[PDB]
Amino acid sequence: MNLPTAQEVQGLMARYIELVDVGDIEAIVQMYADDATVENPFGQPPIHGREQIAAFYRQGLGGGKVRACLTGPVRASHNGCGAMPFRVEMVWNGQPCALDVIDVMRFDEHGRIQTMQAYWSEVNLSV
Amino acid sequence: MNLPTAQEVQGLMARYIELVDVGDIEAIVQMYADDATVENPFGQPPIHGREQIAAFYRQGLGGGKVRACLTGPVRASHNGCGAMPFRVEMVWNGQPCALDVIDVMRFDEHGRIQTMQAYWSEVNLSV
Ligand SMILES: O=[N+]([O-])c1ccc(O)cc1[N+](=O)[O-]
Ligand SMILES: O=[N+]([O-])c1ccc(O)cc1[N+](=O)[O-]
Ligand SMILES: [Mg+2]
Ligand SMILES: [Mg+2]
């Protein structure tokens, strides 16, 4: 595809959450542009490139026991960007916990994620 | 205050929604830096400065019949920024309607909104 339309952004961002929810690290990485950046949480320096991004998702999702679901609709733009609210459920030293997040994404002219910014801070974590 | 902490960002952004919900145009404008920008929706060129911002809110809220409420928690950063999901309820040619929005804000070193970006597109509008 080219620069995704608003409807395509909504589909791609929902697909991303699906891949996080099942923990398909390789499929997530494929959604990113080869030189994409991730800022997690927003406020921290970006990581760069598919290998660093793969390392990120392997760390976050490789231990298993992670689920993610949209908590409301994707809000898309007409310039290939969008924002979405979701909750990540995991386990903290064996206890269930949740993290509320908003991701902002910009897609490139091939429909790949160029930038991801994950807004959250520690008070978005609940035990 | 100085650059708001994560907790202060959560308070300021929730306060903003409160002021939108009651329609206090003057109090909203006061939350913005004198030279702030608003991008509504994200993808459109910014408006600039408190007068243009006041004109924006007078247009959006001056006709009355607008409510706004968070639909989930504010996601704040440690660098004075945050993102929040909310729903705006209004009336379209006399019929109830809703718009789902995510605002991203950056605050300045005085606790005023420097930039606001409102993510939404037409399929976030429901009649
Ligand atoms: O660190 N996180 O929990 C996180 C934040 C934003 C995301 O898009 C995905 C994840 N994750 O893979 O879990
Ligand atoms: O255009 N809008 O509905 C809108 C979008 C983002 C906002 O922070 C506020 C409003 N509003 O005043 O209604
Ligand atoms: Mg490229
Ligand atoms: Mg200033």
Swiss-Prot record, chains A, B:
Membrane-spanning residues: none
InterPro entries registered for this protein in UniProt: Ketosteroid_isomerase (IPR039256), NTF2-like_dom_sf (IPR032710), SnoaL-like (IPR037401)
Mutagenesis or variant effect for D103 to A/L: Reduces activity 100-fold. Reduces activity 10000-fold
Result, substituting Y32S: Reduces activity 4-fold
Binding residues for substrate: D103
Reported impact of D103N: Reduces activity 4-fold. Reduces activity 10000-fold
Superkingdom field: Bacteria
An individual GO BP term: steroid metabolic process
Reaction equation(s) it catalyzes: a 3-oxo-Delta(5)-steroid = a 3-oxo-Delta(4)-steroid
Subunit text: Homodimer.
Stated name of the protein: Steroid Delta-isomerase
Organism: Pseudomonas putida
